[PDB]
Design a protein around this ligand. Structure first.
Ligand SMILES: Cc1ncsc1-c1ccc(CNC(=O)[C@@H]2C[C@@H](O)CN2C(=O)[C@@H](n2cc(C3CC3)nn2)C(C)(C)C)cc1
Ligand SMILES: [Cl-]
Lengths: 89, 149, 104
C-alpha cells in the first residue's frame, strides 16, 4: 500500500497509495516499475511539498479538529502552483 | 435571490468563534439576499453577538475573501437558544486544494497588473485573476438549494 | 497523539506517521516493512544525535509541535553494509530558483 514518486533530481519519495491517489494524474499514471512514477519536470523541493500536502489533505479532510494553514514559502509558490495544476490536487 | 435572511424578529444569541489563522469577515445576507460586512475577528478570538432565527451568515478571509467554513459547512443559520445557551458558530479553514492554496500565496505576493508577467501557461493567468467573491459563491449555493428542493 | 515523519537516507524519503508513545525500534520495524532491511542493520538519527532503540518518539523530540502533517520532522537513517554501519548521509533537496522580479 506504499508507492514511489521520483523527482527530476532522482529523490525517491515513498508515500501511502491512498495519499498519492489524492492526485487524479498520479491515479491515471499508476494504471515506471510497478508502484513507481517518475516526474521528469518536478524537482525534490516541489515534490517533497506535494507529498506533505497529501499527508495534510488525508489527515484534515472531514475532520472536526481545528485545521492549520498549509504553509508555502514564496520561493517555491510558482513551481508548486504549476505542479498542483499538472497533478490536479 | 432565494438565499436571504428570514425576517423572524426572533432574537438568537451566537458566539462567533474564529478557529482559523485568518482575520475573519462575517457576512450577513440581508432580506434582499445582499451581503453585508460586519466587524472583523482576529485569529483565535470569539465574540457573543445578537442575531435572529432564520438569518443567514457566511464567513470569508477579511483581506482576500477566501472561503471559510462555519460548523464544517458554507452557511450558518441561528436557531432558538435552549436553556439560555448561546449557539456556537465555529469558523474554520476548509482543506483548500493545493492548486487553490498556491493561487492564494501567488495572489498575496504579486499585484494583479503583474499576473501576466509570470512565466506560466495562459490558463493559470485566468485562474489567478478569478479571485474568490461572495456573489459567485451565493449563486452556486442558490443552485445547490434548488437541486436539493 | 499522531506524529508525521520523513525518514531519510541518501536520496530516499519515507512519508509516514507513528504514535508519540511508540519506540525508535518500533519505527525501525516500519522501515523493515517498506525497505526490507532488519532493525539490527538500521541506525536512526535526530540531526547528528543517534537515537537509542528503547526511547519513545516523544522522548526523541517528535511531538504534535515538531511533527505535523504539513510540516513533518526528519528522522535520519544509516544502513549497515555487511560489517560496519555507514556514515549518516542525507542528500539535501534541490534549491528553489531566485524569486521572480514581480514577486520581489
Ligand atoms: C461586534 C461584532 N463582531 C463581529 S460581528 C459583530 C456584530 C456587531 C453588532 C451586531 C448587531 N446585530 C445585528 O446587526 C444583527 C445581525 C444580523 O442578524 C442582522 N442584525 C440586525 O440587527 C438586523 N435586524 C434587526 C432586526 C429586528 C426586527 C428584529 N431584524 N434584522 C438589522 C441590521 C438592524 C437590519 C451583530 C454582530
Ligand atoms: Cl496567504
Amino acid at each position: 500500500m506504499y508507492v514511489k514518486l521520483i523527482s527530476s533530481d532522482g529523490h525517491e519519495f515513498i508515500v501511502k497509495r491512498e495519499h498519492a491517489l489524492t492526485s487524479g494524474t498520479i491515479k491515471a499514471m499508476l494504471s515506471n516499475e510497478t508502484n513507481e512514477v517518475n516526474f521528469r519536470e518536478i524537482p525534490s523541493h516541489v515534490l517533497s511539498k506535494v507529498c506533505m500536502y497529501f499527508t495534510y489533505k488525508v489527515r484534515y479532510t472531514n475532520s472536526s479538529t481545528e485545521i492549520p494553514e498549509f504553509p508555502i514559502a514564496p520561493e517555491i509558490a510558482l513551481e508548486l502552483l504549476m505542479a498542483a495544476n499538472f497533478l490536479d490536487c | 435571490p432565494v438565499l436571504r435572511s428570514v425576517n423572524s424578529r426572533e432574537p438568537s444569541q451566537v458566539i462567533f468563534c474564529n478557529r482559523s489563522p485568518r482575520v475573519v469577515l462575517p457576512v450577513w445576507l440581508n432580506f434582499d439576499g445582499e451581503p453585508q460586512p460586519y466587524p472583523t475577528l482576529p485569529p483565535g478570538t470569539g465574540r457573543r453577538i445578537h442575531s435572529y432565527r432564520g438569518h443567514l451568515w457566511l464567513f470569508r478571509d477579511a483581506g482576500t475573501h477566501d472561503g471559510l467554513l462555519v460548523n464544517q459547512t458554507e452557511l450558518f443559520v441561528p436557531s432558538l437558544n435552549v436553556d439560555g445557551q448561546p449557539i456556537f458558530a465555529n469558523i474554520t479553514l476548509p482543506v483548500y486544494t493545493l492548486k487553490e492554496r498556491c493561487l492564494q500565496v501567488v495572489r498575496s505576493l504579486v499585484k494583479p497588473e503583474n499576473y501576466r508577467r509570470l512565466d506560466i501557461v495562459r490558463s493559470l493567468y485566468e485562474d489567478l485573476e478569478d479571485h474568490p467573491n461572495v456573489q459567485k459563491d451565493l449563486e452556486r449555493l442558490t443552485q445547490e438549494r434548488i437541486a436539493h428542493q | 497523539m499522531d506524529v508525521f515523519l520523513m525518514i531519510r537516507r541518501h536520496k530516499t524519503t519515507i512519508f509516514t506517521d507513528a504514535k508519540e508513545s511508540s519506540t525508535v525500534f518500533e519505527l525501525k520495524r516500519i522501515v523493515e516493512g517498506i525497505l526490507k532491511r532488519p532493525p539490527d542493520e538500521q541506525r536512526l538519527y535526530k540531526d547528528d544525535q543517534l537515537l537509542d532503540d528503547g526511547k519513545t518518539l516523544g522522548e526523541c523530540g517528535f511531538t504534535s509541535q515538531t511533527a505535523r502533517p504539513q510540516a513533518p520532522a526528519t528522522v535520519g537513517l544509516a544502513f549497515r553494509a555487511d560489517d560496519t554501519f555507514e556514515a549518516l548521509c542525507i542528500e539535501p533537496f534541490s534549491s528553489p530558483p531566485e524569486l521572480p522580479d514581480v514577486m520581489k
